[PDB]
Amino acid sequence: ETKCTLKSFTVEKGIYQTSNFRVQPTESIVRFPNITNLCPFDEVFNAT
């Protein structure tokens, strides 16, 4: 990777920065309020 970054097949003595490390997320979470305000859809559809 150091070779690939320097764009050369030979590397001299030293310290070289090559890439970045970052922990990838594990899973996704979605949060919303207590959505319970339902309309009278059923009360209208089942009306006599």
Ligand X SMILES: *[C@@H]1O[C@H](CO)[C@@H](O)[C@H](O)[C@H]1NC(C)=O
- Which spans of this chain sit near another protein (rule: CB under 8 A)? 1-3, 9-35, 44-45
Q: Least distance from C-beta 12 to ligand X, angstroms?
A: 6
Report if residue 13 touches ligand X, rule: CB under 6 A: yes
Residue 37 binds what, of another protein, ligand X, none (CB under 5 to 8 Å, by partner type)?
none
Distance CA 1, CA 18 (A): 7
Q: Which is nearer to ligand X, 33 or 40 (CB)?
A: 33
Distance CA 27, CA 30 (A): 10
From 35, 3, 37, select the one nearest 19 (Cα to Cα).
3
